[PDB]
From a paper:
α-1,3-Glucanase (E.C.3.2.1.59) hydrolyses the α-1,3-glucoside linkages in α-1,3-glucan, which is found in fungal cell walls and extracellular polysaccharides produced by oral Streptococci1,2. α-1,3-Glucanases are classified into family 71 and 87 of glycoside hydrolases (GHs) based on their amino acid sequences. GH 87-type α-1,3-glucanase was isolated from the culture filtrate of Bacillus circulans KA-304 and termed Agl-KA. Agl-KA hydrolyses the α-1,3-glucan of oral Streptococci as well as of fungi.
In this study, we successfully determined the x-ray crystal structure of AglΔDCD-UCD using the Se-MAD method. The crystal structure of AglΔDCD-UCD was determined at a resolution limit of 1.83 Å. Two molecules (molecules A and B) were positioned in the asymmetric unit and were essentially identical (root mean square deviation, 0.14 Å); hereafter, molecule A is used for discussion. Five Ca+ ions, two Zn2+ ions, two SO42− molecules and one polyethylene glycol chain were observed within one protein molecule. The positions of three Ca+ ions (out of five) were relatively buried in the protein structure, indicating these may contribute to protein stability. The overall structure of AglΔDCD-UCD comprised an N-terminal galactose-binding-like domain (~180 residues), followed by a right-handed β-helix (~400 residues), as determined based on the CATH domain classification. The striking difference between AglΔDCD-UCD and other β-helix folds of CASH is the presence of the galactose-binding-like domain, which forms a complex with the β-helix domain. The interface area between the galactose-binding-like domain and the β-helix domain was 1743 Å2, indicating that a large surface area was buried upon complex formation and the complex was stabilised. Interestingly, a Ca2+ ion is coordinated to the carboxy group of D1067, D1090 and water molecules, with pentagonal–bipyramidal coordination. The β-helix fold creates a concave surface along with the β-helix direction, resulting in a consecutive groove of the putative substrate recognition cleft.
Residue numbers in the entry: 0 to 575
Write the structure that this text describes.
C-alpha cells in the first residue's frame, strides 16, 4: 500500500504548523534568550533560530494566538530545563492555559536530554564536559481542538525553582484512533492492558506468535503499553517471513520501554520477507549511549525486503533506526526498505543509519530533529562480509537541530541520493557531510552520488567536537578519495563559517556543483581556524591542495571572506 502525502517542494509535509519564538507574546518575567553568534556555551545555540523564551520564575509565560485556518488538539513543545548535578536529570512541569483557562499541567524531565563533551565521546554527567542536547520535546492532546483566535499560554507555576525554556509549539488536528483491522489479532487478546503501568511484553510476544501462526495483522489499540525489555520480533534461529504491526496512531498508541539498562529496550526485527510497522509512538527509558554499546535503538537488525516502517514517532533511543545485520555470515541485508511519514527526534545518536550493505532503501517525508549524530546516514560497513550498500535515498525530509555531525551523511558505496530536503540549525557540524574515516567500503566503485533541490539554513560550524570548522556542506577525504558527487540546486543560507569545505589528503575527483546559491557566510564571526590560518567564513574553502571541484552557475551574497574563496594552493577550483 501507498501512504499518500502530497509532498512539499523541499522538506517534509506534516500536518502541524509551527508557533515559534518570535510569534509569542512574553510576560510575567519571561525573557528572550539568543545566541546570534552561534556560541555553543549558550543554551540558545541549540534553539531554533538560536532564540527561545526563558521562563525563569513563577508567572513567566509565552503565549501564542492560533492563526486563521490553523489549530487542532495535538500539541508538541520543544523545551529546555536544567540537568541535575549527578546527570540523572530533574523532573518538573509547565502549565498550559487556553483563553486564560488552565487546561493541563504537563510533566517534564531532563532525564533523556543533556550530554557532555570533553572529547568526541559523550559523558553522562555535567562533570564530563560542555553540554549539548539541551533541548527536548513533549507532546499532549487537548480536550478540545484549538481554534483560530484561541490563545495558548505556556506558563511556569509555583511548583519549583527551575528555569524552563520554550522554543516553539507545533499544533495539529489529531485524527481519531485507527480501527482494528478485520481478522487481526490484538495485543489485548493476549493479556496486554493499556494505561495501567503494568508490563505488557509477555502479551506482545504471545501476540506476535499468534499473528505469525495465523497470518493475521497484529494490532496495538489506543493507549500506553509498557515493555520492560527489548521487544524481539522473531529470532535468528526462527526468523519471521512476513508481519504487519499497526497501532491506532502516533497520537493514540504509545509503546513505553521502561528498562534503562544496556540492550533492554527498542525493537529488534528478525524478518526475512516484508514487515510493515506503522502508526505507533515509541519512547525509551534511555539516558546514555553506553559508549556505542547501548544496543537500544528504536528499530534494529533484520528489516527484510520491500519493508516499510511508516507513520511512527520515536524518540530518546540510542538511534531512531539502525538497519543492519550482525547475526549472519555472510551478512544478510535489507533491500528496498522505506521509512516514511515519521518523526525521529531527540535520539542520543543517529536518526537513521543504513548500514551493513542496506541497499535500495529510503527515508522520505520525515521529521528528523535534535539527534546526537548524523540525522540520516549511510555507513557502508562490511562486518561479516556484508556487501557494499548501494542506491539509498534520503528525500523530502526536514532535518532540524542536529547537535553532532551532519543532517545527512554518506560514507561509502554507490548511487545514493539526497534530494528535496530542508536542513536547518545544525550545531557543531554540517547540513551535509561525506568522509572516508569509517571502516568498510568507501567510494572507489561509486558510479555517482547526487544531492539536489535542497535548502540549508544556519548550518556549518566553527567548533565541532575536535574544536574545528566544518562547512555547511563538508567533504573530507580522510583516507580514501571522495569521488563522483554532484550537487544541484542547493540554497545555502546564513552559514556559520564556510558554506562549502574540502579537506584532508585522500583526493577529490569528479565533484560537480551546479546551480548553487550561497547567501551569507561567516555569520558566527569566528576567525580562529583548526586547519588553516585565521580567516572569516568563505563561500568555498579548502585546506588541502589535493583535489578538484567544478562549479556551474554559482551565485554568492553576504560573504564574510573578502576573497569569496579561500583555497589552499594546488586545489583545482573551476567556477564557470
Ligand atoms: Ca496509515
Ligand atoms: Ca526559536
Ligand atoms: Ca543526560
Ligand atoms: Ca499494561
Ligand atoms: Ca553516527
Ligand atoms: Ca544563476
Ligand atoms: Zn503500512
Ligand atoms: Zn568509541
Amino acid at each position: 500500500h501507498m501512504n499518500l502525502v502530497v509532498y512539499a517542494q523541499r522538506g517534509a509535509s506534516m500536518p502541524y504548523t509551527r508557533y515559534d519564538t518570535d510569534d509569542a507574546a512574553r510576560g510575567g518575567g519571561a525573557t528572550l534568550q539568543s545566541a546570534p553568534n552561534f556560541d555553543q556555551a549558550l543554551t540558545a545555540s541549540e534553539a531554533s533560530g538560536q532564540r527561545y523564551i526563558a521562563l525563569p520564575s513563577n508567572g513567566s509565560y509565552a503565549q501564542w494566538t492560533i492563526r486563521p485556518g490553523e489549530g487542532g488538539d495535538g500539541v508538541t513543545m520543544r523545551f529546555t530545563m536544567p540537568d541535575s548535578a549527578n546527570g540523572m536529570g530533574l523532573n518538573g512541569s509547565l502549565d498550559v492555559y487556553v483563553n486564560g483557562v488552565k487546561a493541563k499541567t504537563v510533566p517534564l524531565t531532563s532525564y533523556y536530554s543533556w550530554q557532555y563533551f570533553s572529547s568526541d565521546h559523550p559523558a553522562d554527567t555535567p562533570a564530563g564536559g560542555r553540554p549539548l542536547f539541551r533541548f527536548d520535546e513533549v507532546h499532549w492532546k487537548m480536550d478540545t481542538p484549538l481554534q483560530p483566535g484561541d490563545t495558548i499560554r505556556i506558563q511556569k507555576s509555583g511548583a519549583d525553582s527551575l528555569e524552563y525554556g520554550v522554543d516553539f509549539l507545533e499544533i495539529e488536528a489529531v485524527p481519531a484512533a485507527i480501527a482494528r483491522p478485520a481478522n487481526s489479532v490484538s495485543v489485548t487478546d493476549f493479556g496486554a492492558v493499556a494505561n495501567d503501568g503494568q508490563d505488557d511484553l509477555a502479551a506482545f510476544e504471545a501476540a506476535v506468535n499468534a499473528a505469525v501462526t495465523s497470518g493475521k495483522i497484529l494490532y496495538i489499540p489506543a493507549g500506553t503499553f509498557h515493555l520492560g525489555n527489548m521487544w524481539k520480533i522473531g529470532s535468528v534461529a526462527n526468523k519471521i517471513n512476513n508481519i504487519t504491526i499497526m497501532g491506532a496512531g502516533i497520537w493514540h498508541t504509545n509503546i513505553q520501554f521502561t528498562n534503562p539498562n544496556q540492550a533492554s529496550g527498542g525493537i529488534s526485527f528478525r524478518v526475512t520477507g516484508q514487515l510493515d510497522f506503522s502508526h505507533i509512538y515509541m519512547n525509551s527509558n534511555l539516558r546514555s549511549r553506553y559508549g556505542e554499546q547501548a544496543v537500544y535503538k528504536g528499530f534494529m537488525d533484520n528489516f527484510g525486503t520491500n519493508s516499510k516502517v511508516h507513520n511512527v514517532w520515536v524518540e530518546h533511543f540510542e538511534c531512531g533506526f539502525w538497519v543492519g545485520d550482525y547475526a549472519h555470515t555472510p551478512a544478510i541485508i535489507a533491500n528496498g526498505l522505506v521509512i516514511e511519514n515519521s518523526r525521529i527526534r531527540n535520539n542520543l545518536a543517529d536518526g537513521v543509519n543504513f548500514a551493513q550493505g542496506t541497499s535500495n532503501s529510503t527515508v522520505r517525508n520525515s521529521s528528523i530533529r535534535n539527534n546526537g549524530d548524523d540525522g540520516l546516514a549511510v555507513w557502508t560497513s562490511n562486518v561479516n562480509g556484508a556487501p557494499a550498500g548501494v542506491n539509498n535515498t534520503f528525500s523530502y525530509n526536514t532535518i532540524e537541530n542536529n547537535w553532532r555531525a551532519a543532517g545527512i551523511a554518506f560514507f561509502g558505496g554507490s548511487g545514493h541520493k539526497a534530494t528535496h530536503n530542508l536542513i536547518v540549525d545544525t550545531v557543531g557540524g554540517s547540513a551535509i557531510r561525506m568522509n572516508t574515516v569509517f571502516p568498510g567500503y568507501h567510494f572507489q566503485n561509486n558510479t555517482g552520488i547526487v544531492f539536489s533541490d535542497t535548502t540549508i539554513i544556519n548550518s556549518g560550524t566553527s567548533r565541532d567536537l575536535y574544536n574545528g570548522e566544518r562547512g555547511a556542506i563538508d567533504l573530507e577525504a580522510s583516507n580514501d578519495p571522495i569521488k563522483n558527487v554532484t550537487f544541484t540546486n542547493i540554497d545555502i543560507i546564513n552559514t556559520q563559517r564556510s558554506a562549502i569545505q574540502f579537506g584532508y589528503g585522500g583526493g577529490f575527483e569528479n565533484i560537480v556543483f551546479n546551480n548553487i546559491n550561497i547567501n551569507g557566510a561567516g555569520k558566527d564571526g569566528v576567525l580562529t581556524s583548526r586547519f588553516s590560518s585565521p580567516h572569516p567564513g568563505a563561500a568555498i574553502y579548502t585546506y588541502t591542495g589535493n583535489g578538484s571541484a567544478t562549479f556551474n552557475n554559482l551565485t554568492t551574497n553576504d560573504i564574510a571572506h573578502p576573497n569569496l574563496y579561500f583555497i589552499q594552493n594546488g586545489f583545482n577550483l573551476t567556477i564557470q
